Amino acid sequence: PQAAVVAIMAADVQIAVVLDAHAPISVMIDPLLKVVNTRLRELGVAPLEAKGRGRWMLCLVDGTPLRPNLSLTEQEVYDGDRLWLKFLEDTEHRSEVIEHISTAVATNLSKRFAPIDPVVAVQVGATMVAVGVLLGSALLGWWRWQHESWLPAPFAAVIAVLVLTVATMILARSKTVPDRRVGDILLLSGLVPLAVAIAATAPGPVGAPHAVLGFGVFGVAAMLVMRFTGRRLGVYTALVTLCAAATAAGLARMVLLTSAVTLLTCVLLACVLMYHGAPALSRWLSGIRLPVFPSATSRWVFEARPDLPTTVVVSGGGQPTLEGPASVRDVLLRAERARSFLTGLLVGLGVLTVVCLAGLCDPHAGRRWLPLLLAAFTFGFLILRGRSYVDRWQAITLAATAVLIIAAVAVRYVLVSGSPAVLSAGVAVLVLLPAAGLTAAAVVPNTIYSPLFRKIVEWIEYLCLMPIFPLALWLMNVYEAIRYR
Amino acid sequence: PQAAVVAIMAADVQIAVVLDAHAPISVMIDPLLKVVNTRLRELGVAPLEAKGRGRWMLCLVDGTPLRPNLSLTEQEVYDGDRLWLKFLEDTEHRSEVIEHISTAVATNLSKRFAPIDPVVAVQVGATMVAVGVLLGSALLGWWRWQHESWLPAPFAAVIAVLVLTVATMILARSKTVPDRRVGDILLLSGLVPLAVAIAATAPGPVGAPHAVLGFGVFGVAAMLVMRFTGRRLGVYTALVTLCAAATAAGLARMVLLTSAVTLLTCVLLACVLMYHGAPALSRWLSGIRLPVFPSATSRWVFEARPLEGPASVRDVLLRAERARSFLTGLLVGLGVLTVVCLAGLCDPHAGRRWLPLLLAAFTFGFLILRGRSYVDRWQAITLAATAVLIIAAVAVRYVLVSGSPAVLSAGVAVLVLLPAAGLTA
Amino acid sequence: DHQRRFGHDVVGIREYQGQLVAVVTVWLPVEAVAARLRQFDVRLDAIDIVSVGTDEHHTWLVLRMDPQRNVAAVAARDSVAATLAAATERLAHDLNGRRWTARPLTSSEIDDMDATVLAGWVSPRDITSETLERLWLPDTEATAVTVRLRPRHGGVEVSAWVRYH
Amino acid sequence: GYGLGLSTRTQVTGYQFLARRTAMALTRWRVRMEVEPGRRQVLAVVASVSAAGVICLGALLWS
Amino acid sequence: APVVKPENIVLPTPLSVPPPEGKPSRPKLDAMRAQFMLMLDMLRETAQESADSMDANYRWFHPAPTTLAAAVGSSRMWERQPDGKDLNFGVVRVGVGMTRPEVTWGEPQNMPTDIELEPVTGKALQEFGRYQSVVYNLPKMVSLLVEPWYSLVGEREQVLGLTRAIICQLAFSHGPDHVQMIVVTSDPDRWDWVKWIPHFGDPRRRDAAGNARMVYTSVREFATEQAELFAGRGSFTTPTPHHVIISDIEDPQWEYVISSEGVDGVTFFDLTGSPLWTGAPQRVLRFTDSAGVIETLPRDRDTWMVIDDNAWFFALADQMSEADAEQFAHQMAHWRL
């Protein structure tokens, strides 16, 4: 006769039984408990026993009971079905309130009305500790500048040492597997008090070489942090750029005792040259290496068919392991590293070129039109250079750099000079030039220019790129020196 | 043994079930699907079906799948939680290999990062012209602060009217996209030169009349752009809060000759009242029935969907989101007022200098206590932030204007230790 | 106001900047209906057990919900009325069983309930348990006993009061 | 294999070609090189430095 | 069923350059290099589209063992007859690995001599030939009709996981009327999950639960003498039920019923690799890595014939736990067709 074979769940173990497919539940539930108890005693588990009043009765997985006066087939139970054998205080325990809810918005909206998760609290606390230590280092440096004394140098060192040790202990994985953010934030923040202490160690009103050593130790510390951690490449890359430029300028300041105008101009030429080598340096730092060429090997067919990387599942629970392509997977990782380096270079060079064009002080009468004209050429340079970059934040970095050069020169002329004409011109350029940028952004992608005009606009870039070196030499007066020396 | 009542959801239907708490997920995932299919077929709704190749997963409503080899209890599902019954498509496919270094780099960056496009470009232009006109208005204010010239006010007026007309034309003509925030940025930027233009018409030396007039007109214009547009309503709420306080201070220095300390303390009292008043006042402001432009969350709810019927849930969602934005704006504005008044009061060269330090300590405790109350992330973050910045401001002022190594050491010590104590919690 | 759904029965809703729904039930019942105060995603503001006396005797559970505390739960559902209708049907089907039958109130009989509560005085008491039986004893022409359940600090805290005649 | 050694003109110009192609891939996410602006503008920098040196030699003589 | 089309693509001819000669066209060369590189990229995208077609074909025909919970519609769709479905009737998935694509890279003609060969184009063509000559992470399969037996050598749990994946692939893709299975074991508690599967049902003996389960605790215990009157097998360059016999008993009695030639229409999976079954290196699937990398003699993609006689990487084994196999078995037991 027909029989159904089902898996009875009882006492957290699975027991397969054979049941009559046509007798009612209440007929066959009496020997079934005996069979299940016998199997539980074979397994050496505490047998099923009742408490209070009720009946032994078989529920589906959700808890709805089977009708005891109907067979298994009349209730649509088939082979391989799982039934839970339970003792229930009453024969009625359904929950018939089915409810319509759109699952997409339900599973969506929960994560963005979420309350404050304490991991977010830890991240916020780490951020605010970072702001605090930055303010403390800044105040200690300001005190060392204003009040030349031995006092601030050891205190900054102690704070830096304790913060870096705390950060390293955090990064030591004893408290942080997934959120390296806390460790990176604390580590980056603690480096500034170290540089402040090292700079304040040197005597004199300023840190003795006009704070070469502070910027140098900051730069090398950031280089080593990238070398060991390699996570936040963009940020430390920008800081390394700024520190390198500051150290070069300070070393030339103390060794040669040259003018600050000469220093700013040569740093400007350095950034101008560096904008063109920035893609190359970002390639080189990322570890992307172009293939080695065969010098004298005659063989050219290599059927070595390189093997497979088996990416083991991070749970480590014996799950089926997946396969990447080859060793060339690292081209992907080095690619985002290269993008991060290039973004960092663009940010740092932008900051440096904005700072260098703040070396424009007096009104335009006399020789002062030459550095302003240099500013105009570098503005056209950077604002047309943005075509060569596709990622939005690099293009925005160049455009922002270009407009901030004009912003900085205008605010310096209007603040230093007391001429109302200078004020009117400055506010006029501040309101018109970004408005012109907005109109250009609105119109240009939506209209079709002549290829001739496209060639001219292509050539303003080169035509304003060229004359900046003779203007730089005019500002440095190298020509007059060669005229006279 | 334990059983956990949970409500699973699948095929736009939620069903309450009583799952065994100790049997593994892989044991229950099979019959549970049969139960759900039975219930849906009884309702006349189309049952769940497997498409292609994949496997069924019980997932938390946040989106993570549960582990098939572990029961609910080991992976900390508790009674009353909701589960989601997905059919994950099998992700297992071939791995593309691009052997050439240059082509591989090009395609990997092109596939994985966002290129610049006109949608972002117009917003960048609007942002930078906003920054430019804010600098221009602040700069004309600086010149009128330093010099008695009447002529800056025509410049501020003309630039304000030009940018406001351009913003209005963009808002009217180009309302068709959520990139109408270009107009909002311009209008927010252009209200400021209008305010400094009106303020610069106050004759004589600069002072409270210029201040009361400028902040009064700027707050009034903020309230009008609230009622006419109602899109950027959080930031206008913060701005009208700041203008309300500044206008009250200006009328207190014109109608009376009150000292600065008394006004700063009275503003502080108003702020500590207002921190209590804020969560109910925002629910009043929810009902102002300003025009309905949904913000991001409401937009991206409405894209996934079409007192009874959907109009009710639409109204509820819009009201709730407006209330949230109002309350966030209020907290930010009150935080700014709190930090500026505690900065103003705490002068070290005062005989009564011990008292405002005490006030700072008590209000620090008060805000941190209140930070536990609100459920939204950025509201509590704002309260904690302004709590940190009050001690930051008093410490930086004491170490700046007082040239003593002792107060320098004390300030630089507490400024690192106390946020570290916050980090410990 | 009335609502129908996938569910079984019509639920009466009254709204005045917030919703009011009553469930009638027909001795000593379990005090733990407060478990259904916090359902899966909806958060009811209060549960009031209301019982009135005179000879007749009637018992109702009245439900309070603020949608503004439940925007996430409402936004997934088809309407704000269908939310509290679903919660009402859950509580009604939970109670419905052994001896006491329960059903949601029709909108007309909500006002009938209001009239029978009015029918035309002592202080609240703090220590609540087992005093309810001795509280019903004193002579009256009418008496209304009510116990309020509210969520509180993640738990449920109980308060009650009674008036006579 | 790999190591310090000796290299020819064709190898070094080929290396420079791959460097420029990788630079275009990195900056612009395109690799088609029917025209490359990078060469054009680095030659503009070279012209800048050459003109600077020329005017440097020019001002050495007269005064 | 998705379709895959073969191709034949000749590689482009690399550039040539004369060396200089002592002493007592850079832009043209770079333009030629650029044109070569673009042609190479066109060939690469053609390779990608062909590889995606073949990927979709194989994973249509051979799903992952985990994804066999969807046990209807495509279930048991293979057909006995020696045509059409014969292209996949006998063959089952064992893991993922490399395979040669459907494009056949023609050897580029007019190759310049090794001194005239330009460095960049030569190296790029070298790399193209190296990497585009295989497709990575495609299912690797084992044909039951070409070998008398296969042997699994490795740790106990790896071998059991692969065996469960094999059993489940056979059960899903082949009906009970075409494939029947036997398990001969010394550890019966690990094979208790197979009682659900219909293919283990012996039609001749009936019990209360239905057909008798074909799981035996010793090779001597065999009452299936009907499957042992066959001859030694002819390899398939179809018998009505093909029998698959798992064995992990480690019994010296095998060589009586197992000649060097095997048995016709039956294939054996020797778990617990022993010197009796490992007497042919092409029939040994040896675990090497802890993760489950298999090494065996490479075979032709189309004809399953052995290519060379040294062991090489074959596949990363699909190891499937007891819980997943039991879930599939409960799903599979519902069906009767």
Numbering used by the authors:
A (entry chain D): 18 to 502
B (entry chain X): 18 to 323, 339 to 457
C (entry chain E): 95 to 120, 140 to 167, 194 to 259, 288 to 332
D (entry chain B): 12 to 74
E (entry chain C): 13 to 36, 96 to 308, 318 to 417
Q: What text does the study give?
A:
We therefore generated two new maps imposing C6 symmetry for modeling these regions: a global map with a 3.4-Å resolution and a locally refined map of the cytosolic part of the protomeric units at 3.0-Å resolution. Because of the observed sixfold symmetry of the TM and cytosolic segments of the ESX-5 complex, we first defined its overall arrangement as consisting of six identical protomeric subcomplexes. Within each protomeric unit, EccD5 was observed to assume an elliptical ring-shaped dimer composed of 22 (11 per EccD5 monomer) TM helices (TMHs) forming the core of the protomer. We observed that one of the EccD5 molecules is proximal and the second one is distal to the central pore, and we annotated them as EccD5-1 and EccD5-2, respectively. We noted that the EccD5 ring-like arrangement is further supported by interactions at the cytoplasmic face formed by TMH6 and the elongated TMH7, connected by an extended loop. Because of the approximate twofold symmetry of each EccD5 dimer, TMH11 of EccD5-2 was found most distal, and TMH11 of EccD5-1 is the closest to the central pore. Both TMH11 helices displayed a distinct diagonal orientation with respect to the remaining EccD TMHs and the pore axis (see below). In our model, contacts between TMH11 from EccD5-1 and the only EccB5 TMH establish a scaffold for the central pore. Besides these interactions at the interface between the membrane and the cytoplasm (membrane cytoplasm inset), we observed several specific electrostatic interactions of the EccC5 stalk domain with the N-terminal EccB5 helix, situated parallel to the membrane. In our structure, the DUF domain was the most distal rigid component at the cytosolic face of the ESX-5 complex.
